[PDB]
Every structure is written in C-alpha cells, then in structure tokens.
Write a protein that binds this ligand. Structure first.
Ligand code: AWH
Ligand code: AWH
Ligand code: PLP
Ligand code: PLP
Lengths: 300, 300
C-alpha cells in the first residue's frame, strides 16, 4: 500500500524535465528540477517540514509552543501548511505591504498574521518577531537563514534526487541563492561524490551581494536576500552569475509559453544563468541541472 | 536516468493521503487522491494531454490545426499548458464574466481568449466555439464532455493508480461528477477487477441533475454541469450523494486548516460525501478512496 500518513510525507521527490525550446545556443543538455511539484508549490516545503522535524527530534517543541517566523515569501506558506498538518499554532510577521491574496492564502492554512509598518519592510518584520520571542517563551522561531536543518534536508533529499535521477551524470548545478540552503546542500553531497561537479550561484544584477556589490531593491522574489546568509557555504560555489530583472522575467515567460512550465521569476533567473553556462564550448555534451524553485501562478 | 522529455510526461501518478482529523464519526478508513499534484494543479491535466494524444494518434492534427474549446474551468488551464508544451495554437472561448486572474493565467501559457457575452454564460461560449469550428476547418475541438479519451485516460492512469496504491484493497470510490470521466474510468476498471467495489457520484444539492432534479446555479466549480454528460456511465454508479454549498465550503476549509490540504470547493464536496458514507456501520473497516480534483489557491 502506498498511502502517505499526512501531506508532509509527500514533500520533495520532485521530477527533472529536459528543456526543448528555451535552449538558444546551448551546446550542453539543460534539465530543470521542478520544485513546484511540492504540495504547496515551492521548494520551501522541504525546509518547512525539515526545520520543524529537527526541532521535534531535538525536544524543542513543548505542549504550549507556538511557531513564529518573519517571512514575506514561500517559507511562510510552507510553514503554514506544515503547521496545519502538524496541528501547531503558526504566527507569521510581515510588512503590511503584503498583498491581500498572500494574506488570504496564509490564513486559509490557519496561520495568524502580524502585520508590521510598510515603511520598515523586512527589518520591521524581523524586529517584531525578535521582540515577541524575547518576551514570550512559547515562541519557537525556525530562523530559515541560520537553521542547519535547511541545508541538511537538501543534502538528504534534493541532492540525492539529483544524483539518482541523473544516474550520477550531472556535471553542473545552477541555483538561485536566497537562504543558500539548496545550492549548499546539493553541493555538499554532489561535490564530494563527484569532485569534477561544478556549482553556479545565481543572484540579481540589481542586488549583487555575493559578487561583492551592494544591496538594492529588486523584483526577483526568493533570491537576493541582501547579505551573505550564514547557511550558505561560499567555498563550494564555483561561479556567481548576476541576472537582470528583464532577462529573468523574459525567460520565465518563455518557459511558460514554450515549455508549458509556468514558473516564478527566480526560475527565469536561474534559467538565464543555465543558458549562459550552456553556451560555453568547454561545456559541450555536459549535463546542467537547473533548480526551478516555484510555480508562476502566485505571481499573477 | 529519470528525466521527462516534456511536462506532459509528468501528468498523473498522483499520491494517496490518509485523512486524520476531518473524519468525524467515521468507521471506515478515508484516503484522498490528491489531483492537485498534477503540473497545473488539477485533474484536468490528464484529459488535456489525453484528448490531444488521441487526436494525434488518430491523425486529426494537421500542420495548420488550431485547438479550440469552450471552457470556464480547469480544462482550459490544462489545454493551455498542454498546447504550450506541444507548440500548438490554443483558442478558448468563455463568458466575459471570467476573472482577470483566470485570463492572465490562460494567457501566461500563450492561449488566446475569445470572450463572449456575460449574460449568455456557458451556452454563449459553446455557440461561439460551434460557429468558429463550423466556418473554419483549422479548428480541432476536443469536446471534453463527449470525448472517449476522457474516460479512457482514467481507465489507464487514475484507476490503475488507485488499484496499485491500495494493493487492490479499495472498497468504495467517492468522486464528484463534472464530465463524469473520472468516476466512469475508475469504475470501468475497478468494478470489473473487484465486483464488490462500489462507486458514489457526488453532485450539488443546488443542481441535483443526476438525482433526477433540475439544473440550478451553484458555486461548486467543476461538478454539477446541469445535464447528464454522455461520457458518464450511470450504470456503474451505485449511489448519488448531493452536497450543499455551505457543507462543501466548510469541509474544504477544514481540509486546509486541519490536514494542510488546500483544495478547491469540489474537493470539499467529495469529502462531505466520503464522510457520510464512512459513518455507515456496514462500512466498518472498509477503505474509501475520495478524489480531490484541484488546489484551493486558485479560489482565493
Ligand atoms: C529581499 N530580502 C531581504 O531584504 C531580506 C532580509 C533579512 C531576512 C531575514 C534575516 C535577515 C535579513 O536581512 C538583514 C541583514 O541584512 O542582515 S530577506 C529577503 N528576501 C528573501 C529571500 C528568501 C526568503 C525570504 C522570506 O521572507 O521568506 C526573503
Ligand atoms: C455549470 N456548467 C454548465 O452549465 C455547463 C454547460 C455545458 C458545457 C459544455 C457542453 C454542454 C453544456 O450544457 C448544455 C446542456 O445543458 O446540454 S458545464 C458547467 N460546469 C462545468 C463542469 C466541468 C467543466 C466545465 C468547464 O467549463 O471546463 C464546466
Ligand atoms: C527560497 C527560494 C529560492 C532560493 O532557495 P534557497 O535554498 O533559499 O537558496 C529561490 N526562489 C524562490 C521563489 C524561493 O522561495
Ligand atoms: C473536472 C472537475 C471535476 C469532475 O471531474 P470529471 O472527471 O469531469 O467528472 C471536479 N472538480 C473540479 C475542480 C474539476 O475541474
């Protein structure tokens, strides 16, 4: 019998698809890992479950614990879904600038939202979470940017899925860096097993922090956090490619129209970079795996 | 190597999950088949690909063919996605009442929309498609309510997935009837292989046509078509349960909040009916498979 006990057991195990049309000038094979196949349509499902599992296994969840995280992204949606399956109480802080669509989605999962001043943005959401946690001991805050379970779940699931589905033939992995968990976990496993493997981090040209530049605003949701996340292991990253907003959006649109892959803007970004790498003659005949983090419908 | 050639090869093979909390008074086991795991988040992905495959295999697609279908539902989204993967031109007719969100989603896949008068509703969308097809021979119209490939793909995929994942232990399948393809295809295979198996069709109390009542408006998108669809085989249906709008919506909300299963209203409907059947003492210890047709996010 193959029946999951709950929805969190159906997280991960996402498929690879070969790009057929969005391949201009490529001399390498480009295959895309479709993180939108996760139950709530993003890669963050993996760290939502994993950060809570790790807390559970370490005895950090008490009968009165409340899950708390400042998030304006997919991690909130994943945490809300995972808390609803677990029967945990979930509080999320975010700027009051968040769309009503997003709020309704979080509340549909039974999450409670604390809206913080629009002008303070993310830092205000963090300050509010910091203060709530400091003054009420019931709160457990997963801390997606620091939590070792983020890269760990990618070592154990994402990486092995890439390894097995490519029969060890993957040569290059291309991934947008938000928390850095995905590329770090995959590199940690794959680079040791196959030392010739290479890893390309993608960030916005508009906020080129890993390249050595300065934080700036940008629309590529999920990547370009504006600082070097502690979870990221830069020594495993072989190259950084910056991607402009317009190219990221153009390639995302091409993915939907030409491959039937309706993906988010950060998937467009990662694909820009995978196309770039794929054009290099030294990469003729190589297999490039590109991570597509989420579904595009959420962005319309 | 496990790499799909395109997105249409990743349709189907959706998982079963056991309901844990939305089970009040049940004496039977209730497991849910999560059709939202399909690439465009609904069961209709299966018939989008299948109706086009059948046309291809029967030589009905010509170099200048244009796909045309009147649809205000998930079949449009599936057809748009499948046409985008295939590189076919896709035209959909629908009432101008359709939300801008829906239109943007269809156009994101490169589909072309013909908006018909709001007052004529579905019949106007059908009349427009009828007339375009009649006067331009390039149009191929899949005809989801009549196309034998609709129940066929359910015989070949959905049914076998239910059979294998339950190790032949499924006793009762509960499914909302829209086109009727799902319940028909599953019954056709399962009832012959296990003649004690039973099948429950679900329709809206607000439009109880299969029960012998009259068409009326209702919000349970995907079911209650308002007539007996030709594709449906009523002789395989063992019982009809009607479901009220409020119960359908209440159970859908409970699924999201209590199981982390964010599903559409018709999934709430099917679950109402599965809970009802599950309370009958004669069903103690039986395995009930309930089809959950789509993701809830599209409804917010
Ligand atoms: C644009 N942006 C930011 O500005 C962020 C700031 C942030 C978020 C969490 C912790 C620290 C933080 O930065 C303070 C610093 O500069 O050290 S996080 C961010 N984007 C992301 C990237 C990935 C996930 C998320 C999320 O909110 O779930 C947000
Ligand atoms: C509420 N409703 C209707 O009223 C429909 C009418 C219809 C749709 C297609 C063909 C015939 C039709 O009816 C005319 C008749 O009464 O014989 S179809 C419908 N709902 C559904 C159910 C399942 C799928 C779809 C869809 O538009 O993709 C629509
Ligand atoms: C989280 C996220 C990323 C980056 O993944 P990390 O493992 O955090 O580096 C990219 N895109 C989107 C849409 C995300 O939600
Ligand atoms: C199509 C559909 C159904 C019914 O499935 P059929 O196989 O057409 O009977 C139920 N709910 C939703 C949301 C649908 O799109």
């Amino acid at each position: 019998m193959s029946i999951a006990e709950d929805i969190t057991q159906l997280i991960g195990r996402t498929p690879l698809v070969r790009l057929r049309r969005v391949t201009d000038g490529a001399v390498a094979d480009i295959v895309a890992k479709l993180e939108f196949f996760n139950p709530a349509n993003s890669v963050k499902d993996r760290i939502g479950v994993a950060m809570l599992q790790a807390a559970e296994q370490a005895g950090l969840i008490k009968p009165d614990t409340i899950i708390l995280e400042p998030t304006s992204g997919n991690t909130g949606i994943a945490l809300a879904m995972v808390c609803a399956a677990r029967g945990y109480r979930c509080v999320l802080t975010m700027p009051e600038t968040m769309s009503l669509e997003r709020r309704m989605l979080l509340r549909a999962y039974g999450a409670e939202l604390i809206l913080t001043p629009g002008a303070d943005g993310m830092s205000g959401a963090i300050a509010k979470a910091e203060e709530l946690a400091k003054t009420d001991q019931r709160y457990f805050v997963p801390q997606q940017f620091e939590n070792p379970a983020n890269p760990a779940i990618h070592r154990v699931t994402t990486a092995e899925e890439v390894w097995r589905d490519t029969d060890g033939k993957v040569d290059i992995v291309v991934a947008g860096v938000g928390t850095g968990g995905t590329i770090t976990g995959v590199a940690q496993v794959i680079k040791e097993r196959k030392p010739s493997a290479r890893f390309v981090a993608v960030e916005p040209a508009a906020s080129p922090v890993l390249s050595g530049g300065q934080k700036g605003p940008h629309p590529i949701q999920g990547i370009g956090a504006g600082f070097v996340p502690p979870v990221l292991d830069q020594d495993l990253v072989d190259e950084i490619i910056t991607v402009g907003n317009e190219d990221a959006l153009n390639v995302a649109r091409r993915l939907a129209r030409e491959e039937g892959l309706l993906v988010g803007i950060s998937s467009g970004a990662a694909t820009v970079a995978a196309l770039q790498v794929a054009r290099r003659p030294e990469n003729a005949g190589k297999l490039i795996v590109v991570v597509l983090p989420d579904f595009g419908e959420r962005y319309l």
